[PDB]
Design a protein around this nucleic acid. Structure first.
Length: 164
DNA sequence: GTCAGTCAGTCAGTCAGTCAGTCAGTCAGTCAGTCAGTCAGTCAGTCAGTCAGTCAGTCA
Protein backbone atom coordinates (compact mmCIF):
# COMPACT_ATOMS: atom_id res chain seq x y z
CA UNK A 1 0.00 0.00 0.00
CA UNK A 2 2.88 2.34 0.78
CA UNK A 3 4.48 1.52 -2.57
CA UNK A 4 1.40 2.18 -4.68
CA UNK A 5 0.73 5.40 -2.72
CA UNK A 6 -2.90 4.52 -2.07
CA UNK A 7 -4.99 5.96 0.75
CA UNK A 8 -7.04 3.11 2.25
CA UNK A 9 -10.34 3.42 4.08
CA UNK A 10 -11.86 1.55 7.02
CA UNK A 11 -15.55 2.06 6.16
CA UNK A 12 -15.83 2.25 2.37
CA UNK A 13 -16.44 -1.42 1.60
CA UNK A 14 -14.31 -1.22 -1.56
CA UNK A 15 -11.56 1.32 -2.18
CA UNK A 16 -11.34 0.99 -5.95
CA UNK A 17 -9.23 2.52 -8.67
CA UNK A 18 -9.01 1.90 -12.41
CA UNK A 19 -6.88 -1.19 -11.68
CA UNK A 20 -6.93 -2.26 -8.01
CA UNK A 21 -9.26 -3.00 -5.09
CA UNK A 22 -8.99 -2.71 -1.31
CA UNK A 23 -11.59 -4.83 0.50
CA UNK A 24 -12.67 -4.58 4.12
CA UNK A 25 -15.17 -7.42 4.71
CA UNK A 26 -18.81 -7.02 5.64
CA UNK A 27 -20.12 -6.16 9.10
CA UNK A 28 -22.85 -8.74 9.75
CA UNK A 29 -20.54 -11.72 9.24
CA UNK A 30 -18.07 -10.11 11.66
CA UNK A 31 -20.71 -10.33 14.38
CA UNK A 32 -21.83 -13.77 13.21
CA UNK A 33 -18.37 -15.33 13.38
CA UNK A 34 -17.57 -13.50 16.61
CA UNK A 35 -20.68 -14.86 18.34
CA UNK A 36 -19.68 -18.22 16.86
CA UNK A 37 -16.29 -17.97 18.55
CA UNK A 38 -17.91 -16.86 21.80
CA UNK A 39 -20.51 -19.65 21.82
CA UNK A 40 -18.03 -22.38 20.97
CA UNK A 41 -15.75 -21.41 23.86
CA UNK A 42 -15.38 -18.44 26.18
CA UNK A 43 -11.60 -17.98 25.96
CA UNK A 44 -12.45 -17.52 22.30
CA UNK A 45 -14.55 -14.72 23.75
CA UNK A 46 -11.41 -13.45 25.47
CA UNK A 47 -9.72 -13.57 22.08
CA UNK A 48 -12.67 -11.45 20.96
CA UNK A 49 -11.48 -9.20 23.77
CA UNK A 50 -7.90 -9.54 22.56
CA UNK A 51 -7.11 -6.67 20.21
CA UNK A 52 -5.22 -9.11 17.97
CA UNK A 53 -8.50 -10.67 16.85
CA UNK A 54 -9.97 -7.22 16.20
CA UNK A 55 -6.91 -6.28 14.13
CA UNK A 56 -7.33 -9.53 12.21
CA UNK A 57 -11.00 -8.52 11.79
CA UNK A 58 -11.26 -4.71 11.72
CA UNK A 59 -7.58 -3.96 11.03
CA UNK A 60 -4.90 -1.82 12.65
CA UNK A 61 -4.82 1.53 10.87
CA UNK A 62 -2.37 2.82 13.52
CA UNK A 63 -4.48 6.01 13.56
CA UNK A 64 -3.96 6.02 17.34
CA UNK A 65 -0.69 7.98 17.25
CA UNK A 66 -1.17 11.75 17.34
CA UNK A 67 -1.89 13.43 14.01
CA UNK A 68 -2.45 17.10 13.04
CA UNK A 69 -1.15 19.88 10.82
CA UNK A 70 -0.81 23.65 11.03
CA UNK A 71 0.02 26.51 8.68
CA UNK A 72 3.20 27.34 10.64
CA UNK A 73 6.49 27.19 8.75
CA UNK A 74 9.47 24.83 8.92
CA UNK A 75 13.24 24.91 9.43
CA UNK A 76 14.85 21.75 8.05
CA UNK A 77 14.14 19.31 5.21
CA UNK A 78 14.90 15.60 4.82
CA UNK A 79 14.63 12.88 2.17
CA UNK A 80 14.52 9.25 3.29
CA UNK A 81 13.94 6.08 1.27
CA UNK A 82 13.13 8.11 -1.83
CA UNK A 83 10.47 10.20 -0.05
CA UNK A 84 10.75 13.89 0.73
CA UNK A 85 9.90 15.07 4.23
CA UNK A 86 9.36 18.45 5.83
CA UNK A 87 9.60 19.45 9.46
CA UNK A 88 7.02 22.13 10.22
CA UNK A 89 7.76 24.25 13.28
CA UNK A 90 4.98 25.91 15.29
CA UNK A 91 5.26 29.53 16.37
CA UNK A 92 3.93 28.77 19.85
CA UNK A 93 4.01 25.75 22.18
CA UNK A 94 6.67 24.04 20.06
CA UNK A 95 4.30 21.42 18.62
CA UNK A 96 6.50 19.95 15.90
CA UNK A 97 4.99 18.65 12.66
CA UNK A 98 6.48 16.29 10.09
CA UNK A 99 4.03 17.15 7.32
CA UNK A 100 5.14 16.67 3.71
CA UNK A 101 5.83 20.31 2.84
CA UNK A 102 8.81 20.18 0.48
CA UNK A 103 9.40 23.59 -1.08
CA UNK A 104 11.94 23.50 -3.92
CA UNK A 105 14.66 25.61 -2.34
CA UNK A 106 18.42 25.91 -2.10
CA UNK A 107 17.92 25.53 1.66
CA UNK A 108 19.98 22.91 3.46
CA UNK A 109 18.54 19.40 3.04
CA UNK A 110 19.82 16.37 4.96
CA UNK A 111 19.71 12.60 4.59
CA UNK A 112 21.15 9.58 6.36
CA UNK A 113 20.83 6.82 3.76
CA UNK A 114 23.82 6.96 1.43
CA UNK A 115 21.64 6.34 -1.62
CA UNK A 116 20.33 9.92 -1.27
CA UNK A 117 22.86 12.37 -2.69
CA UNK A 118 22.24 15.53 -4.71
CA UNK A 119 24.36 18.38 -6.03
CA UNK A 120 22.38 20.72 -3.79
CA UNK A 121 22.01 18.95 -0.45
CA UNK A 122 24.20 17.66 2.37
CA UNK A 123 24.81 14.27 3.93
CA UNK A 124 24.99 13.84 7.72
CA UNK A 125 27.00 11.42 9.85
CA UNK A 126 28.20 10.76 13.43
CA UNK A 127 25.13 12.33 15.01
CA UNK A 128 25.56 15.80 13.56
CA UNK A 129 21.80 15.79 12.91
CA UNK A 130 21.39 15.53 16.68
CA UNK A 131 23.39 18.78 16.82
CA UNK A 132 21.42 20.32 13.96
CA UNK A 133 17.78 19.44 14.73
CA UNK A 134 18.10 19.58 18.50
CA UNK A 135 14.52 20.73 18.89
CA UNK A 136 13.22 17.88 16.74
CA UNK A 137 15.20 15.30 18.69
CA UNK A 138 13.97 16.67 22.02
CA UNK A 139 10.42 17.17 20.74
CA UNK A 140 10.18 13.52 19.77
CA UNK A 141 11.82 12.68 23.08
CA UNK A 142 8.98 14.81 24.46
CA UNK A 143 5.30 14.86 23.57
CA UNK A 144 5.76 17.94 21.37
CA UNK A 145 6.06 16.10 18.07
CA UNK A 146 2.99 15.32 15.96
CA UNK A 147 2.94 13.36 12.70
CA UNK A 148 0.65 14.43 9.89
CA UNK A 149 0.26 11.08 8.10
CA UNK A 150 0.45 7.38 8.89
CA UNK A 151 3.03 6.84 6.16
CA UNK A 152 4.86 9.91 7.47
CA UNK A 153 4.61 8.70 11.06
CA UNK A 154 5.99 5.23 10.40
CA UNK A 155 8.69 6.53 8.04
CA UNK A 156 9.81 8.88 10.81
CA UNK A 157 9.89 5.92 13.19
CA UNK A 158 12.19 3.89 10.97
CA UNK A 159 14.31 6.98 10.32
CA UNK A 160 14.80 7.31 14.07
CA UNK A 161 15.65 3.62 14.25
CA UNK A 162 18.32 4.10 11.59
CA UNK A 163 19.55 7.34 13.18
CA UNK A 164 21.38 5.58 16.02
C1' DG B 1 76.53 89.69 75.56
C1' DT B 2 75.36 90.07 69.04
C1' DC B 3 76.02 88.75 63.29
C1' DA B 4 74.65 83.98 61.85
C1' DG B 5 77.22 79.60 60.85
C1' DT B 6 78.96 75.53 58.38
C1' DC B 7 80.09 70.30 59.14
C1' DA B 8 77.39 66.02 62.41
C1' DG B 9 72.18 63.86 63.85
C1' DT B 10 67.76 64.09 61.70
C1' DC B 11 63.38 62.99 58.78
C1' DA B 12 61.02 63.63 54.08
C1' DG B 13 62.12 60.33 50.31
C1' DT B 14 62.68 57.11 48.02
C1' DC B 15 64.18 52.37 44.98
C1' DA B 16 65.12 49.01 43.62
C1' DG B 17 64.15 44.42 46.11
C1' DT B 18 59.77 41.20 47.90
C1' DC B 19 55.48 37.93 48.77
C1' DA B 20 52.48 35.39 47.08
C1' DG B 21 47.15 35.56 44.94
C1' DT B 22 45.44 34.57 40.84
C1' DC B 23 44.41 33.44 36.57
C1' DA B 24 46.34 29.85 33.37
C1' DG B 25 48.23 26.63 29.94
C1' DT B 26 47.94 22.39 30.51
C1' DC B 27 47.96 17.84 32.04
C1' DA B 28 47.49 13.39 31.34
C1' DG B 29 43.27 11.30 33.51
C1' DT B 30 39.35 9.42 32.85
C1' DC B 31 35.18 7.95 32.24
C1' DA B 32 31.73 7.81 29.53
C1' DG B 33 29.49 8.50 25.09
C1' DT B 34 30.19 6.78 20.26
C1' DC B 35 31.11 2.99 17.00
C1' DA B 36 32.82 -1.97 14.52
C1' DG B 37 33.70 -7.00 14.42
C1' DT B 38 30.93 -11.21 16.56
C1' DC B 39 27.72 -14.51 16.49
C1' DA B 40 22.76 -16.71 15.62
C1' DG B 41 18.91 -17.62 12.34
C1' DT B 42 17.73 -18.15 8.22
C1' DC B 43 18.44 -18.13 2.96
C1' DA B 44 20.24 -20.15 -0.90
C1' DG B 45 22.82 -24.56 -2.12
C1' DT B 46 26.59 -28.93 -1.79
C1' DC B 47 26.54 -34.62 0.16
C1' DA B 48 24.86 -40.25 -0.30
C1' DG B 49 20.81 -42.79 1.19
C1' DT B 50 15.68 -43.55 0.30
C1' DC B 51 11.45 -44.03 -2.90
C1' DA B 52 9.62 -46.82 -6.31
C1' DG B 53 9.23 -46.68 -11.85
C1' DT B 54 11.02 -49.17 -15.34
C1' DC B 55 13.67 -51.99 -20.47
C1' DA B 56 14.85 -56.44 -19.65
C1' DG B 57 17.89 -63.03 -18.80
C1' DT B 58 16.45 -66.77 -17.53
C1' DC B 59 11.98 -69.41 -18.73
C1' DA B 60 5.57 -70.76 -20.09
Amino acid sequence: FLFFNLVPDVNKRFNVYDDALIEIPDSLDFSSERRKTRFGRLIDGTEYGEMSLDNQFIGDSQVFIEKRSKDSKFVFSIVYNGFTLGVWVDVNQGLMYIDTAHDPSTKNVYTLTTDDLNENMMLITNYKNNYHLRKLASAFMNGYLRFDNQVIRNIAYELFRKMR
